[PDB]
Write an enzyme that holds these catalytic residues in place. Sequence first.
Site, PDB file in Angstrom:
ATOM      1  N   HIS A  16      64.160 -98.687  -7.593  1.00  0.00           N
ATOM      2  CA  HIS A  16      65.004 -98.086  -6.583  1.00  0.00           C
ATOM      3  C   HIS A  16      65.640 -98.752  -6.102  1.00  0.00           C
ATOM      4  CE1 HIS A  16      61.440 -94.823  -6.644  1.00  0.00           C
ATOM      5  NE2 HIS A  16      60.636 -95.479  -6.719  1.00  0.00           N
ATOM      6  N   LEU A  24      68.286 -80.516   0.524  1.00  0.00           N
ATOM      7  CA  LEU A  24      69.130 -81.994  -0.684  1.00  0.00           C
ATOM      8  C   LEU A  24      69.217 -81.478  -1.652  1.00  0.00           C
ATOM      9  CD1 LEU A  24      70.361 -84.666  -1.118  1.00  0.00           C
ATOM     10  CD2 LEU A  24      67.972 -84.967  -1.676  1.00  0.00           C
ATOM     11  N   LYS A  34      75.046 -89.085 -10.677  1.00  0.00           N
ATOM     12  CA  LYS A  34      76.330 -89.848 -10.325  1.00  0.00           C
ATOM     13  C   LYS A  34      76.504 -90.841  -8.842  1.00  0.00           C
ATOM     14  CE  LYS A  34      79.236 -87.253 -13.425  1.00  0.00           C
ATOM     15  NZ  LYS A  34      78.909 -85.700 -13.767  1.00  0.00           N
ATOM     16  N   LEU A  77      75.020 -89.918  -6.120  1.00  0.00           N
ATOM     17  CA  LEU A  77      75.911 -88.489  -4.428  1.00  0.00           C
ATOM     18  C   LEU A  77      74.347 -88.339  -3.385  1.00  0.00           C
ATOM     19  CD1 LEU A  77      78.309 -87.059  -3.647  1.00  0.00           C
ATOM     20  CD2 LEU A  77      77.631 -85.026  -4.847  1.00  0.00           C
ATOM     21  N   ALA A  78      72.846 -88.016  -4.258  1.00  0.00           N
ATOM     22  CA  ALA A  78      72.294 -88.073  -3.156  1.00  0.00           C
ATOM     23  C   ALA A  78      72.087 -89.430  -2.468  1.00  0.00           C
ATOM     24  CB  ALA A  78      70.078 -87.910  -4.088  1.00  0.00           C
ATOM     25  N   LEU A 100      59.561 -75.442   4.645  1.00  0.00           N
ATOM     26  CA  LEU A 100      59.439 -73.731   4.740  1.00  0.00           C
ATOM     27  C   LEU A 100      59.843 -74.388   3.026  1.00  0.00           C
ATOM     28  CD1 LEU A 100      61.682 -72.511   7.264  1.00  0.00           C
ATOM     29  CD2 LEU A 100      59.048 -72.530   6.588  1.00  0.00           C
TER      30      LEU A 100
HETATM   31  C1  LIG Z   1      66.705 -90.588  11.151  1.00  0.00           C
HETATM   32  C2  LIG Z   1      67.123 -89.432  10.256  1.00  0.00           C
HETATM   33  C3  LIG Z   1      67.082 -89.708   8.742  1.00  0.00           C
HETATM   34  C4  LIG Z   1      67.664 -88.434   7.235  1.00  0.00           C
HETATM   35  C5  LIG Z   1      67.678 -88.813   6.499  1.00  0.00           C
HETATM   36  C6  LIG Z   1      65.830 -89.170   5.380  1.00  0.00           C
HETATM   37  C7  LIG Z   1      65.977 -88.745   4.800  1.00  0.00           C
HETATM   38  C8  LIG Z   1      65.710 -88.140   3.706  1.00  0.00           C
HETATM   39  C9  LIG Z   1      65.484 -87.822   2.105  1.00  0.00           C
HETATM   40  C10 LIG Z   1      65.694 -86.253   1.403  1.00  0.00           C
HETATM   41  C11 LIG Z   1      64.818 -86.049   1.475  1.00  0.00           C
HETATM   42  C12 LIG Z   1      64.721 -84.210   0.845  1.00  0.00           C
HETATM   43  C13 LIG Z   1      63.571 -83.323   0.776  1.00  0.00           C
HETATM   44  C14 LIG Z   1      63.969 -81.952   0.253  1.00  0.00           C
HETATM   45  O1  LIG Z   1      65.132 -81.562   0.134  1.00  0.00           O
HETATM   46  S1  LIG Z   1      63.249 -81.918  -1.753  1.00  0.00           S
HETATM   47  C15 LIG Z   1      64.396 -81.211  -2.797  1.00  0.00           C
HETATM   48  C16 LIG Z   1      65.294 -81.792  -3.289  1.00  0.00           C
HETATM   49  N1  LIG Z   1      65.793 -80.647  -4.084  1.00  0.00           N
HETATM   50  C17 LIG Z   1      66.098 -80.682  -5.247  1.00  0.00           C
HETATM   51  O2  LIG Z   1      64.913 -81.555  -6.596  1.00  0.00           O
HETATM   52  C18 LIG Z   1      67.097 -79.430  -6.608  1.00  0.00           C
HETATM   53  C19 LIG Z   1      67.100 -80.070  -7.444  1.00  0.00           C
HETATM   54  N2  LIG Z   1      67.900 -81.512  -7.845  1.00  0.00           N
HETATM   55  C20 LIG Z   1      68.642 -81.546  -7.029  1.00  0.00           C
HETATM   56  O3  LIG Z   1      69.612 -80.785  -6.355  1.00  0.00           O
HETATM   57  C21 LIG Z   1      69.257 -83.793  -7.552  1.00  0.00           C
HETATM   58  O4  LIG Z   1      67.929 -83.544  -8.159  1.00  0.00           O
HETATM   59  C22 LIG Z   1      68.572 -84.461  -6.359  1.00  0.00           C
HETATM   60  C23 LIG Z   1      69.479 -84.122  -5.285  1.00  0.00           C
HETATM   61  C24 LIG Z   1      67.082 -84.416  -5.710  1.00  0.00           C
HETATM   62  C25 LIG Z   1      69.009 -85.738  -6.514  1.00  0.00           C
HETATM   63  O5  LIG Z   1      70.322 -86.443  -7.421  1.00  0.00           O
HETATM   64  P1  LIG Z   1      70.410 -86.440  -8.520  1.00  0.00           P
HETATM   65  O6  LIG Z   1      69.471 -86.445  -9.632  1.00  0.00           O
HETATM   66  O7  LIG Z   1      71.859 -85.964  -9.192  1.00  0.00           O
HETATM   67  O8  LIG Z   1      70.718 -88.266  -7.997  1.00  0.00           O
HETATM   68  P2  LIG Z   1      72.122 -89.027  -7.649  1.00  0.00           P
HETATM   69  O9  LIG Z   1      71.802 -89.850  -9.285  1.00  0.00           O
HETATM   70  O10 LIG Z   1      72.147 -88.019  -6.894  1.00  0.00           O
HETATM   71  O11 LIG Z   1      70.373 -90.251  -7.432  1.00  0.00           O
HETATM   72  C26 LIG Z   1      69.196 -90.806  -7.783  1.00  0.00           C
HETATM   73  C27 LIG Z   1      68.864 -91.580  -6.024  1.00  0.00           C
HETATM   74  O12 LIG Z   1      68.050 -90.501  -5.155  1.00  0.00           O
HETATM   75  C28 LIG Z   1      66.517 -90.277  -5.678  1.00  0.00           C
HETATM   76  N3  LIG Z   1      66.022 -89.156  -5.266  1.00  0.00           N
HETATM   77  C29 LIG Z   1      65.529 -88.340  -6.010  1.00  0.00           C
HETATM   78  N4  LIG Z   1      65.491 -87.275  -5.842  1.00  0.00           N
HETATM   79  C30 LIG Z   1      64.147 -86.971  -4.535  1.00  0.00           C
HETATM   80  C31 LIG Z   1      64.563 -86.301  -3.958  1.00  0.00           C
HETATM   81  N5  LIG Z   1      63.670 -85.406  -3.920  1.00  0.00           N
HETATM   82  N6  LIG Z   1      65.084 -87.011  -1.986  1.00  0.00           N
HETATM   83  C32 LIG Z   1      64.762 -88.061  -2.028  1.00  0.00           C
HETATM   84  N7  LIG Z   1      65.114 -88.422  -2.980  1.00  0.00           N
HETATM   85  C33 LIG Z   1      65.615 -88.901  -3.902  1.00  0.00           C
HETATM   86  C34 LIG Z   1      65.701 -90.709  -6.436  1.00  0.00           C
HETATM   87  O13 LIG Z   1      65.102 -91.414  -6.181  1.00  0.00           O
HETATM   88  C35 LIG Z   1      67.349 -91.647  -6.681  1.00  0.00           C
HETATM   89  O14 LIG Z   1      67.339 -93.070  -5.557  1.00  0.00           O
HETATM   90  P3  LIG Z   1      66.567 -94.901  -6.367  1.00  0.00           P
HETATM   91  O15 LIG Z   1      65.085 -94.486  -7.410  1.00  0.00           O
HETATM   92  O16 LIG Z   1      67.686 -94.938  -6.707  1.00  0.00           O
HETATM   93  O17 LIG Z   1      66.658 -95.635  -5.386  1.00  0.00           O
HETATM   94  C1  LIG Z   2      58.576 -77.487   0.857  1.00  0.00           C
HETATM   95  N1  LIG Z   2      59.372 -77.240   0.343  1.00  0.00           N
HETATM   96  C2  LIG Z   2      59.983 -76.663  -1.181  1.00  0.00           C
HETATM   97  C3  LIG Z   2      60.211 -77.131  -1.744  1.00  0.00           C
HETATM   98  C4  LIG Z   2      61.010 -78.561  -2.784  1.00  0.00           C
HETATM   99  C5  LIG Z   2      60.674 -79.262  -3.365  1.00  0.00           C
HETATM  100  C6  LIG Z   2      59.070 -79.297  -4.152  1.00  0.00           C
HETATM  101  C7  LIG Z   2      58.268 -77.892  -3.717  1.00  0.00           C
HETATM  102  C8  LIG Z   2      57.158 -78.100  -4.445  1.00  0.00           C
HETATM  103  N2  LIG Z   2      57.311 -78.472  -6.182  1.00  0.00           N
HETATM  104  C9  LIG Z   2      58.594 -77.252  -6.376  1.00  0.00           C
HETATM  105  C10 LIG Z   2      57.981 -76.613  -8.174  1.00  0.00           C
HETATM  106  O1  LIG Z   2      57.059 -76.556  -8.541  1.00  0.00           O
HETATM  107  C11 LIG Z   2      56.880 -77.690  -8.617  1.00  0.00           C
HETATM  108  C12 LIG Z   2      56.431 -78.447  -6.755  1.00  0.00           C
HETATM  109  C13 LIG Z   2      58.561 -77.482  -2.765  1.00  0.00           C
END
Ligand SMILES: CCCCCCCCCCCCCC(=O)SCCNC(=O)CCNC(=O)[C@H](O)C(C)(C)COP(=O)(O)OP(=O)(O)OC[C@H]1O[C@@H](n2cnc3c(N)ncnc32)[C@H](O)[C@@H]1OP(=O)(O)O
Ligand SMILES: CNCc1cccc(CN2CCOCC2)c1
Length: 411
Positions: A2, A159, A168, A170-171, A411
């Site tokens: 990671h 996110l 790319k 960006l996350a 949520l």
């Molecule tokens: C003190 C305050 C702190 C605040 C921040 C607290 C942390 C919050 C953390 C976020 C909590 C979010 C809670 C929710 O909203 S969970 C819902 C997440 N959203 C989706 O699933 C929507 C559909 N997918 C996308 O939009 C993209 O595929 C996302 C944006 C998810 C990744 O974009 P992409 O696919 O274009 O990839 P990349 O090349 O840009 O980036 C790759 C890196 O990203 C890591 N990755 C992948 N998925 C997730 C994920 N769900 N949480 C955390 N990290 C994730 C992955 O392991 C890799 O890292 P590493 O394995 O190389 O190390």
């Molecule tokens: C709690 N916030 C909404 C949520 C965000 C990310 C992922 C999930 C749960 N997934 C949904 C798609 O089917 C597999 C399970 C829920």
Amino acid sequence: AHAFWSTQPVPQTEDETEKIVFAGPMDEPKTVADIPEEPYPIASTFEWWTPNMEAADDIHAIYELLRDNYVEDDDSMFRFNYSEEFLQWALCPPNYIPDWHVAVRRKADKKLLAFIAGVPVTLRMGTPKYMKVKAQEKGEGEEAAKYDEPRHICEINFLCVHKQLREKRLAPILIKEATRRVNRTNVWQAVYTAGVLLPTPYASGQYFHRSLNPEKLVEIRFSGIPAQYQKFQNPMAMLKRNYQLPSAPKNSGLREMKPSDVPQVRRILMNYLDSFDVGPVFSDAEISHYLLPRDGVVFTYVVENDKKVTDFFSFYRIPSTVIGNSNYNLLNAAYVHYYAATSIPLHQLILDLLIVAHSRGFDVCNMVEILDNRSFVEQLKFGAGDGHLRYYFYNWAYPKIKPSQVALVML
Ligand SMILES: CCCCCCCCCCCCCC(=O)SCCNC(=O)CCNC(=O)[C@H](O)C(C)(C)COP(=O)(O)OP(=O)(O)OC[C@H]1O[C@@H](n2cnc3c(N)ncnc32)[C@H](O)[C@@H]1OP(=O)(O)O
Ligand SMILES: CNCc1cccc(CN2CCOCC2)c1
């Protein structure tokens, strides 16, 4: 491996999490002054944008990004379609910090490319009960109790990176910038959930689903038919009969929540939630915000006996786009939210939830096995789903706990 998460203040493996015995921070102590005042660098073709989530048009922009690019099931049959009104509700609770809503736009045309949101929550996140017992045995109770006071932290959600910009990196940039903005407000922990496995959950629960409109659920391949139904001359008629619900609520004195209910609902909810190891603490303003009925968004009913609120339940609406079936645009899902029962068994309270959701045209009721949700699964004909929800902290060591020790609904 990671490349990003290995650099972050989270436990790195299950083995590491297995060894954690006290709640507390992971990172070096820092102050606001230590944190860069300037936004994290991004490519010149991009710009940071802080939407105004009480400007209709900004909410609509976020709404479109999520509608087209947010979470799908594993077979890409359904995609969440959170409504504009839902997003305003979720993103703007009492004392929300506008700067914690972080977007990336293409600078040339202001096309929204990515989003992450944070909102404040007050969370009890001290050492769990089972570990406090061990600490007592070992003469380490002070250390185990050190972080017992409810903490004002960040809850991260939504996110999303546009489909055309995936993989790319960006996350990580979005996460780093959200972390910066939260740290600049003297907040150092976050809580978040995901379906995917990341380093490293403190809890994980299965999803459960209760069919309300089975004919539609089968049509769209949300639901299958147990092989056993093939013993019937008519599998589908039997399926409908199985899931049939009363037309009207059964608890006398169930009604919609109103503003004057707020303090009583706060008291019964807080009394109940305090029994779980991880759970939110809500003020009257937060109870009003999260639980008062909002059309198409959140639905809350109380049981009133002798002019006293003794029970309540709530559910919220997230429809999903039905991606591959041309006969239906949306799947209308109701999600179990907060509740408290003091006068009746929980299954009796939640039956009325199913009744109300069905009466209002919902297709399915969803939940994760947090709270005491397991205590009404069988009686109310919920079935386990394919999905799981994993609970995470940023910058907080926490021992593994059962999902029935989690009281935070996400949520
Ligand atoms: C003190 C305050 C702190 C605040 C921040 C607290 C942390 C919050 C953390 C976020 C909590 C979010 C809670 C929710 O909203 S969970 C819902 C997440 N959203 C989706 O699933 C929507 C559909 N997918 C996308 O939009 C993209 O595929 C996302 C944006 C998810 C990744 O974009 P992409 O696919 O274009 O990839 P990349 O090349 O840009 O980036 C790759 C890196 O990203 C890591 N990755 C992948 N998925 C997730 C994920 N769900 N949480 C955390 N990290 C994730 C992955 O392991 C890799 O890292 P590493 O394995 O190389 O190390
Ligand atoms: C709690 N916030 C909404 C949520 C965000 C990310 C992922 C999930 C749960 N997934 C949904 C798609 O089917 C597999 C399970 C829920």
